[PDB]
């Protein structure tokens, strides 16, 4: 069906040249145009401009022209946003999104991209560390059981985390990033489970960095006494 | 250059009443030509992409929930839900594509608001494989809470800890509304092993006492 798929997390030092994709499917690429919009920190979308694959004809906010540039694949039915100098302000979230070309048509924005987002750094990139959590009696009471993975020392965000490679959804809190002092993220997921069944049920976390290119699973085990 | 501003920016709505949120552009974006306002409205939920609810001010996408309703013309807007569900929780924006650019408004917080929930309070020794490296980082874990302003001090051996600890709060839940908040403590291993007793103190206006979680250093 209608999809629209972004590249994954990069990550740069200023200075240097970027360009991010949207692969498009499920709809005639030529019926409709490509937004691009950037998410501002806390809250916020800019919209930054359009480009229909059949002229390569853009609109850009004025506040964009000439920072960014637009292009198109109609061949691959893909759009791209490119950066020939990258600044470190330039990191945040990028959405494509679709609209409509037809005549008839508004220029609503109805169906979007996952996001992709672009970090700008002179910092080094480093995966993570990741610990367990252990379910024990000081986090299993009213017989619920905690038990969660440690994600320690990584730069640049994003990391993912899912649990038992996304079979196991409910009761997860994956915490907002902390920085530390360090310049490096740490962040935890946790998962509320039954008690009664810590010794029949595996728990495991799936962490990814793709801008270190880390995959780690770690198995999170009930402690016990040695 | 057609700008769009918000109000409220944030608001805080109980479950099952009405949330209003109001959208006024600075020059109408109603054409006379086409008896129709260029506006749209957007739905933003934490870790999702925005989804599209309204457009032509009020034409409802396919798939929005029918409590969901757009009005207004001209300059002024409005998004209204009834009967707020927790899915509802989110970030809305407004948005002209009457001439370019075609700006957002600046957004507004809907907050739910649910009865009130104390925290569950679990807490995590350092892993072994953690104190190889030589440091020991020891969570505390504040689940599913209502309302969110949640106090955690750390006291090792019954002191007071300041300084050594980081904490991070979770959106708030789309099923049940609630908050989590994690905090970890993080020693060298030489200092943890300074020490015998760790604790987390929790303080929340569901709890009538502060409540501890602790454990003695390797007791097993």
């Known amino acids: 069906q209608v999809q629209l798929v972004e590249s994954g997390p990069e990550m740069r030092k200023p200075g240097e040249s970027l360009k991010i994709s949207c692969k498009t499917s499920?709809?005639?690429?030529?019926?409709?145009?490509t937004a691009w919009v950037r998410q501002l920190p806390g809250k916020g979308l800019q919209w930054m401009g359009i480009?229909?694959?059949?002229?390569?004809?853009?609109r850009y906010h004025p506040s964009v022209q000439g920072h960014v540039t637009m292009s198109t694949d109609s061949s691959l039915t893909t759009a791209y946003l490119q950066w020939s100098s990258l600044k470190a302000s330039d990191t945040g979230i990028y959405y494509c999104?679709?609209?409509?070309?037809?005549?008839?048509?508004?220029?609503?924005?109805?169906?979007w991209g996952q996001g992709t987002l672009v970090t700008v750094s002179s910092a080094s990139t480093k995966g993570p560390s990741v610990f367990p959590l252990a379910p024990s009696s000081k986090s299993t009471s009213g017989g619920t059981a905690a038990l969660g993975c440690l994600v320690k020392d990584y730069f640049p965000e994003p990391v993912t985390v899912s649990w038992n490679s996304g079979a196991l959804t409910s009761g997860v809190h994956t915490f907002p990033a902390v920085l530390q002092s360090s310049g490096l993220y740490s962040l935890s997921s946790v998962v509320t489970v039954p008690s009664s069944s810590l010794g029949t049920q595996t728990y495991i976390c799936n962490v990814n960095h793709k801008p270190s290119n880390t995959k780690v699973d770690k198995r999170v085990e009930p402690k016990s006494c040695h | 250059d057609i700008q769009l501003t918000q109000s409220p920016d944030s608001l805080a709505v109980s479950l099952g009443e009405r949330a209003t949120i109001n959208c006024k552009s600075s020059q109408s974006v109603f054409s006379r030509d086409n008896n129709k306002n260029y506006l749209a409205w957007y739905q933003h939920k934490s870790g999702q992409p925005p989804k599209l609810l309204f457009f032509?001010?009020?034409s409802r996408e396919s798939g929005v929930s029918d409590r969901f309703s757009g009005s207004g013309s001209g300059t002024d807007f409005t998004l209204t839900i009834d009967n707020l569900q927790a899915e509802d929780v989110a970030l809305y924006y407004c948005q002209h594509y009457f001439n370019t650019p075609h700006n957002f408004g600046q957004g507004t917080k809907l907050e739910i608001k649910r009865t009130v929930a104390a925290p569950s309070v679990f807490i995590f020794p350092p892993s072994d494989e953690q104190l190889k490296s030589g440091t020991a980082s020891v969570v505390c874990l504040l689940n599913n809470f209502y309302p969110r302003e949640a106090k955690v001090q750390w006291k090792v051996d019954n002191a007071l800890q300041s300084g050594n600890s980081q904490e991070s709060v979770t959106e708030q839940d789309s099923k049940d509304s609630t908050y989590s908040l994690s905090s970890t403590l993080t020693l060298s291993k030489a200092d943890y092993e300074k020490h015998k007793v760790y604790a987390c103190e929790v303080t929340h206006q569901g709890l009538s006492s502060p409540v501890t979680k602790s454990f003695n250093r390797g007791e097993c």
């Open positions: 032509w001010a009020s």
């Open positions: 499920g709809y005639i690429f030529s019926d409709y145009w």
């Open positions: 480009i229909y694959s059949g002229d390569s004809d853009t």
């Open positions: 999104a679709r609209l409509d070309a037809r005549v008839d048509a508004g220029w609503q924005l109805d169906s």
